[PDB]
Amino acid sequence: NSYSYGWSFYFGALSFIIAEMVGVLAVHMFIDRHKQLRATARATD
Amino acid sequence: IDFSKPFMSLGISIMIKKPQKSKPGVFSFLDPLAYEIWMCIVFAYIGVS
Ligand SMILES: NS(=O)(=O)c1cc2c(cc1Cl)N[C@H]([C@H]1C[C@H]3C=C[C@@H]1C3)NS2(=O)=O
């Protein structure tokens, strides 16, 4: 009744961590863009 | 020799020196939950955050 998960199982699990990291990095780019866009707009005002 | 009917029931069996009871592992505090739950809690922790 014993079992052991293989490398393929650990590839999907490892994909989840990388995907979440990319999501954080993608949101941080969206945040930085708008911050730069607002900073420039304020300076022109 | 002319045997008779079995008066009792037996069967080959392995005898080993009774291995003394073991000490709960150093990480026994993870026993209450299966390894799958601990793995998924980490995923949930990352996903929620
Ligand atoms: N349970 S046991 O091993 O004590 C046990 C086992 C057995 C007993 C009697 C006892 Cl008490 N008798 C039977 C016997 C009764 C009739 C049916 C099978 C033989 C002829 N053989 S057995 O099935 O080998």
From Swiss-Prot, chain A:
The gene is Cacng2. It is found in: Membrane; Synapse, Synaptosome. The L-type calcium channel is composed of five subunits: alpha-1, alpha-2/delta, beta and gamma. Interacts with the PDZ domains of DLG4/PSD-95 and DLG1/SAP97. May interact with GOPC. Acts as an auxiliary subunit for AMPA-selective glutamate receptors (AMPARs). Found in a complex with GRIA1, GRIA2, GRIA3, GRIA4, CNIH2, CNIH3, CACNG3, CACNG4, CACNG5, CACNG7 and CACNG8. Interacts with GRIA1 and GRIA2. Interacts with MPP2. Belongs to the PMP-22/EMP/MP20 family. CACNG subfamily. The chain crosses the membrane at residues 11-31. This is Voltage-dependent calcium channel gamma-2 subunit. Regulates the trafficking and gating properties of AMPA-selective glutamate receptors (AMPARs). Promotes their targeting to the cell membrane and synapses and modulates their gating properties by slowing their rates of activation, deactivation and desensitization. Does not show subunit-specific AMPA receptor regulation and regulates all AMPAR subunits. Thought to stabilize the calcium channel in an inactivated (closed) state.
From Swiss-Prot, chain B:
Detected in cerebellum. Palmitoylated. Depalmitoylated upon L-glutamate stimulation. The chain crosses the membrane at residues 35-49. It is found in: Cell membrane; Postsynaptic cell membrane; Cell projection, Dendrite. The M4 transmembrane segment mediates tetramerization and is required for cell surface expression. Belongs to the glutamate-gated ion channel (TC 1.A.10.1) family. GRIA4 subfamily. Homotetramer or heterotetramer of pore-forming glutamate receptor subunits. Tetramers may be formed by the dimerization of dimers. Interacts with EPB41L1 via its C-terminus. Isoform 3 interacts with PICK1. Found in a complex with GRIA1, GRIA2, GRIA3, CNIH2, CNIH3, CACNG2, CACNG3, CACNG4, CACNG5, CACNG7 and CACNG8. Interacts with CACNG5 and PRKCG. Found in a complex with GRIA1, GRIA2, GRIA3, DLG4, CACNG8 and CNIH2. The postsynaptic actions of L-glutamate are mediated by a variety of receptors that are named according to their selective agonists. This receptor binds AMPA (quisqualate) > L-glutamate > kainate. Ionotropic glutamate receptor that functions as a ligand-gated cation channel, gated by L-glutamate and glutamatergic agonists such as alpha-amino-3-hydroxy-5-methyl-4-isoxazolepropionic acid (AMPA), quisqualic acid, and kainic acid. L-glutamate acts as an excitatory neurotransmitter at many synapses in the central nervous system and plays an important role in fast excitatory synaptic transmission. This is Glutamate receptor 4. It comes from Rattus norvegicus.
